[PDB]
């Protein structure tokens, strides 16, 4: 006597969060000038 | 001045200690990262129990700008045969069947051998060969219809030329000499090598005249002249006081005679006609003899710091790994060590005796196909730690918590065979950003 | 129960509160890596939603 | 682009280089009506352009 | 603090609501300067 299987829906997550992996220093990308050599974003390690 | 936020503000040249080992404090922030790309927190401080202190930057001043004493020791077990250096990935064409193909000459096909990797002393590397390409005879060959004295590719630490009496042009005692000049190759003409694709040939001493020029591939029809000679058959000459060539070896192997009346044999080899050849048109002109050098070369790290330092000159201070700015360009720590011995031919019978095994050592009656003696000098490769210094270069100014710590190769890729990475950074002051 | 925890001494200047709630440790992934292993657990995680 | 300091900002011209890290990371991208676990069963993103 | 009892292991999750201000400008043509704050835990 078999029975449904149960659904699972399989999104992305709400709004993207994660897709961009902020909220780590180190692997974490730039906005800088072409020559301006300090990047005007690091984060911090425990800033979600 | 040198800031920071829990501190007083302390002064002109603190030291800020670049460890590997703390990194198992923050035991979240690289898990994919190797030994050598690492990354850890530069602060040290007990107080803050590190995990939470990985954000307390430390901010230099803003108005000298500073510049960095840079030190470090870099200790590396890295062995002579691997898979990183490309040291098991060469071609080496073969003389695969004769029998089912009805047009005559034999099929040639180029068949690529790997290697056991390990840690190899060269007396052993060249005849850890044999395990390589025997076993692409030993699997494909002999399957096919073709005689056990008919493999193409060996490679060898002998002459041919110690008994050779231009009277005769044969070996007068009839027996090949014992002992270890250079590794070269012994080949049949028609199935050559390649080095190209590896870096194998350094280990040997095969290399080029002029290196850069694309494609090195030693065929073995560039080999003129450097035939090598036929035995004297003193099994005869010495029953009989006449001269004959050693056609047949003991056990039905035959060797490769161009007719059977000539003293000289089909199998070829390069010091053979490195230096018995003429020296302008050969494989002279545009191959070279080196030494034994089992280190292959040492190819040179790039230490790199991605946030300690403001860059050196043409370097885009990019995120991707094969890009990082380098900060120092220190020597592999892979050193030679040339250790001595003579019984070393002699020690190949010690050695043989403790095992009662011809498994390492195949055809030995084929004195061609014998089992290429240990030269004299052998070379084995350790690694010794290397206190190195990188002189003064600049610094950014508010340098981060947590810092990242890059150690890549002469291909630009990570290391995997750092496994002691420690840099020390000392700041100074270079001059003055404010008038 | 309890959680004997407490700060490192350091400033405290003129910040704005607490803010304390609660999730699982499976629930929760290693973000300070740039990749995750023993995070088997899939979706809608309470440290980011 | 949640960021704040990129966030709202106002460019003056120039050129802006621009680099960026994105996840590929098929555990977490991917929320569930289950909470199962994934990268197991084989699951996989991929990136075109 | 002291909690109720579970079953998974557990995060004790604090979310100090404390200063995070930046403030960036470009005195040219691709030179931007980002100025940091947080003023427990600080950085700049």
Same mark, same amino acid.
């Given at each position: 006597?078999?029975?449904?299987?149960?659904?699972?829906?399989?999104?992305?997550?709400?709004?993207?969060?994660? !897709?961009?992996?902020?909220?780590?220093?180190?692997?974490?990308?730039?906005?800088?000038?072409?020559?301006?050599?300090?990047?005007?974003?690091?984060? !911090?390690?425990?800033?979600? | 001045?040198?800031?920071?936020?829990?501190?007083?503000?302390?002064?002109?040249?603190?030291?800020?200690?670049?460890?590997?080992?703390?990194?198992?404090?923050?035991?979240?922030?690289?898990?994919?990262? &190797?030994?050598?790309?690492?990354?850890?927190?530069?602060?040290?401080?007990?107080?803050?129990?590190?995990?939470?202190?990985?954000?307390?930057?430390?901010?230099?001043?803003?108005?000298?700008?500073?510049?960095?004493?840079?030190?470090?020791?870099?200790?590396?077990?890295?062995?002579?045969?691997?898979?990183?250096?490309?040291?098991?990935?060469?071609?080496?064409?073969?003389?695969?069947?004769?029998?089912?193909?009805?047009?005559?000459?034999?099929?040639? %096909?180029?068949?690529?051998?790997?290697?056991?990797?390990?840690?190899?002393?060269?007396?052993?590397?060249? &005849?850890?060969?044999?395990?390589?390409?025997? &076993?692409?005879?030993?699997?494909?060959?002999?399957?096919?219809?073709?005689?056990?004295?008919?493999?193409?590719?060996?490679?060898?630490?002998?002459?041919?030329?110690?008994?050779?009496?231009?009277?005769?042009?044969?070996?007068?005692?009839? +027996?090949?000499?014992?002992?270890?000049?250079?590794?070269?190759?012994?080949?049949?003409?028609?199935?050559?090598?390649?080095?190209?694709?590896?870096?194998?040939?350094?280990?040997?001493?095969?290399?080029?005249?002029?290196?850069?020029?694309?494609?090195?591939?030693?065929?073995?029809?560039?080999?003129?002249?450097?035939?090598?000679?036929?035995?004297?058959?003193?099994?005869?000459?010495?029953?009989?006081?006449?001269?004959?060539?050693?056609?047949? &070896?003991?056990?039905?192997?035959?060797?490769?005679?161009?007719?059977?009346?000539?003293?000289?044999?089909?199998?070829?080899?390069?010091?053979?006609?490195?230096?018995?050849?003429?020296?302008?048109?050969?494989?002279?002109?545009?191959?070279?003899?080196?030494?034994?050098?089992?280190?292959?070369?040492?190819?040179?790290?790039?230490?790199?710091?991605?946030?300690?330092?403001?860059?050196?000159?043409?370097?885009?201070?990019?995120?991707?790994?094969?890009?990082?700015?380098?900060?120092?360009? %220190?020597?592999?720590?892979?050193?030679?060590?040339?250790?001595?011995?003579?019984?070393?031919?002699?020690?190949?019978?010690?050695?043989?005796?403790?095992?009662?095994?011809?498994?390492?050592?195949?055809?030995?009656?084929?004195?061609?196909?014998?089992?290429?003696?240990?030269?004299?000098?052998?070379?084995?490769?350790?690694?010794?730690?290397?206190?190195?210094?990188?002189?003064?270069?600049?610094?950014?100014?508010?340098?981060?918590?947590?810092?990242?710590?890059?150690?890549?190769?002469?291909?630009?890729?990570?290391?995997?065979? +750092?496994?002691?990475?420690?840099?020390?950074?000392?700041?100074?002051?270079?001059?003055?950003?404010?008038? | 129960?309890?959680?004997?925890?407490?700060?490192?001494?350091?400033?405290?200047?003129?910040?704005?509160?607490?803010?304390? $709630?609660?999730?699982? $440790?499976?629930? $929760?992934?290693?973000?300070?890596?740039?990749?995750?292993?023993?995070? $088997?657990?899939?979706?809608?995680?309470?440290?980011?939603? | 682009?949640?960021?704040?300091?990129?966030?709202?900002?106002?460019?003056?011209?120039?050129?802006?280089?621009?680099?960026?890290?994105?996840?590929?990371?098929?555990?977490?991208?991917?929320?569930?009506?289950?909470?199962?676990?994934?990268?197991?069963?084989?699951?996989?993103?991929?990136?075109?352009? | 603090?002291?909690?109720?009892?579970?079953?998974?292991?557990?995060?004790?999750?604090?979310?100090?609501?404390?200063?995070?201000?930046?403030? @960036?400008?470009?005195?040219?043509?691709?030179? @931007?300067?980002?100025?940091?704050?947080?003023?427990?835990?600080?950085?700049?």
């Amino acid at each position: 006597q078999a029975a449904p299987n149960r659904p699972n829906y399989i999104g992305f997550r709400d709004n993207f969060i994660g !897709l961009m992996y902020y909220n780590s220093t180190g692997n974490m990308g730039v906005l800088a000038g072409q020559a301006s050599q300090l990047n005007a974003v690091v984060d !911090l390690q425990d800033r979600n | 001045s040198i800031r920071y936020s829990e501190l007083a503000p302390l002064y002109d040249t603190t030291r800020v200690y670049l460890v590997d080992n703390k990194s198992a404090d923050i035991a979240s922030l690289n898990y994919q990262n &190797d030994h050598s790309n690492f990354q850890t927190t530069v602060v040290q401080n007990n107080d803050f129990t590190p995990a939470e202190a990985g954000t307390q930057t430390i901010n230099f001043d803003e108005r000298s700008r500073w510049g960095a004493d840079l030190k470090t020791i870099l200790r590396t077990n890295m062995p002579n045969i691997n898979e990183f250096m490309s040291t098991n990935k060469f071609k080496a064409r073969l003389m695969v069947e004769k029998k089912n193909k009805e047009t005559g000459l034999p099929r040639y %096909e180029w068949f690529e051998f790997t290697l056991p990797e390990g840690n190899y002393s060269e007396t052993m590397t060249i &005849d850890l060969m044999n395990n390589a390409i025997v &076993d692409n005879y030993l699997e494909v060959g002999r399957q096919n219809g073709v005689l056990e004295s008919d493999i193409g590719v060996k490679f060898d630490t002998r002459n041919f030329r110690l008994g050779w009496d231009p009277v005769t042009k044969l070996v007068m005692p009839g +027996v090949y000499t014992n002992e270890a000049f250079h590794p070269d190759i012994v080949l049949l003409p028609g199935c050559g090598v390649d080095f190209t694709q590896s870096r194998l040939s350094n280990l040997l001493g095969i290399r080029k005249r002029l290196p850069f020029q694309e494609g090195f591939q030693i065929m073995y029809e560039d080999l003129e002249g450097g035939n090598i000679p036929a035995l004297l058959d003193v099994a005869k000459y010495e029953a009989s006081i006449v001269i004959e060539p050693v056609a047949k &070896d003991s056990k039905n192997r035959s060797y490769n005679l161009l007719p059977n009346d000539q003293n000289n044999t089909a199998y070829r080899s390069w010091f053979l006609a490195y230096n018995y050849g003429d020296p302008k048109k050969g494989v002279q002109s545009w191959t070279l003899l080196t030494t034994a050098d089992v280190t292959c070369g040492s190819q040179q790290v790039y230490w790199s710091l991605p946030d300690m330092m403001q860059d050196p000159v043409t370097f885009r201070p990019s995120t991707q790994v094969s890009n990082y700015p380098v900060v120092g360009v %220190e020597l592999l720590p892979v050193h030679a060590k040339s250790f001595y011995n003579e019984q070393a031919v002699y020690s190949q019978l010690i050695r043989q005796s403790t095992a009662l095994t011809h498994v390492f050592n195949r055809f030995p009656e084929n004195q061609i196909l014998v089992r290429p003696p240990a030269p004299t000098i052998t070379t084995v490769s350790e690694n010794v730690p290397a206190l190195t210094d990188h002189g003064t270069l600049p610094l950014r100014s508010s340098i981060s918590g947590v810092q990242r710590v890059t150690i890549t190769d002469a291909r630009r890729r990570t290391c995997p065979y +750092v496994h002691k990475a420690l840099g020390i950074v000392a700041p100074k002051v270079l001059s003055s950003r404010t008038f | 129960t309890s959680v004997p925890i407490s700060i490192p001494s350091r400033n405290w200047a003129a910040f704005r509160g607490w803010s304390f $709630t609660r999730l699982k $440790t499976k629930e $929760t992934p290693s973000l300070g890596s740039g990749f995750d292993p023993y995070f $088997t657990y899939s979706g809608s995680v309470p440290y980011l939603d | 682009q949640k960021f704040f300091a990129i966030k709202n900002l106002l460019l003056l011209p120039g050129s802006y280089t621009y680099e960026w890290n994105f996840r590929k990371d098929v555990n977490m991208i991917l929320q569930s009506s289950l909470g199962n676990d994934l990268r197991v069963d084989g699951a996989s993103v991929r990136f075109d352009s | 603090f002291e909690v109720d009892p579970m079953d998974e292991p557990t995060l004790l999750y604090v979310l100090f609501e404390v200063f995070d201000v930046v403030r @960036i400008h470009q005195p040219h043509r691709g030179v @931007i300067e980002a100025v940091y704050l947080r003023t427990p835990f600080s950085a700049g």
